[PDB]
Amino acid sequence: IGTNHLPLLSVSHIANINPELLVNAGFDSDVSVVDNPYWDWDGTVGRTAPLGAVKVVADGTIKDLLSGPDAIPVVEGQKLNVSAWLKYSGLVAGAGAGSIRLSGTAYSADGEVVAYPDFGGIPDGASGTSDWTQVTGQYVVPAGVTQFRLRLSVRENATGGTVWFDDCSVKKAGLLPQGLVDGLVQALSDLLTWL
């Protein structure tokens, strides 16, 4: 639900909760992999029911995948954390720096890409096989950014294997920023400096 449609909140209803942002983050259903000959939905490989994950074949090329839900409204401050359990089976991809790069798409006010902030992924030497591994990325929002999405990127140097992603979680984390309460920053600074 958009921000401009919420006219008035409830101070009592305000509380401390950090819920998930994306819809169908765990890829447990067919949504978010719609109309794509590159990726597809799977119901037999995964951890959480119904064992739904993303299947893909790396034919020596680059790979990208977009979240089904639209842009998450991201703003300055309000740090975020991004994580996901990734796996690569039969990875014949070239052993190098790149391949899996868990990152996001930061769209501007009109919806323009500004950067490719990598919050995790595999290190150099992209080859072999592994299991569900988690990469954690703390993202701090630069100014002039309004929209966010979670992108799944695999560098062009990849040359084989099947990549699985599950339990995706992009969360807004932290407490109330100091510079939102009225004049409190100035008052506390004044008291401390006076003392």
Partner 1 sequence: DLADAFQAVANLIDAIAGEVGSSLADAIAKLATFLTELSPLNAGMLFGLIGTNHLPLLSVSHIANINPELLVNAGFDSDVSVVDNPYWDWDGTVGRTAPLGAVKVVADGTIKDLLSGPDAIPVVEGQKLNVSAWLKYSGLVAGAGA
Binding positions for its own copies, rule: CB under 8 A: 7, 11, 172, 174-178, 180-184, 187-188, 191-192, 194-195
How far, in Å, CA of 21 to CA of 171, rounded? Answer: 6
Report what 127 binds from its own copies, partner 1, none; CB cut-off 5-8 Å by kind: none
Rank residues 115 and 176 by Cβ distance to partner 1 and give the closer one.
176
Report what 182 binds from partner 1, its own copies, none; CB cut-off 5-8 Å by kind: its own copies
Rank residues 14 and 195 by Cβ distance to partner 1 and give the closer one.
14
* Whole-number Cα distances in Å, 47 to 50, 53, 88, 152, 165: 8, 9, 15, 19, 10
User: For residue 39, what are its two tokens?
Assistant: 């990726």
Report what 186 binds from its own copies, partner 1, none; CB cut-off 5-8 Å by kind: none
193: contact with partner 1 by CB under 8 A: no
Strand pairing class (77-89; 72-73): unpaired
Residue 187 per-residue DSSP state: H
Establish whether the linkage from the previous residue to 50 is cis, with ω within 30° of 0. Answer: yes
How far, in Å, CA of 24 to CA of 32, rounded? Answer: 7
Rank residues 10 and 44 by Cβ distance to its own copies and give the closer one.
10
User: For residue 16, what are its two tokens?
Assistant: 């401390």
CB atoms within 10 A of CB 84: 26
Among 4, 44, 186, 193, interactor with partner 1 by CB under 8 A:
4
150: contact with partner 1 by CB under 8 A: yes
67: contact with partner 1 by CB under 8 A: no
Residues in contact with partner 1 by CB under 8 A are 1-10, 13-19, 70, 73, 75-78, 147-177, 179-180
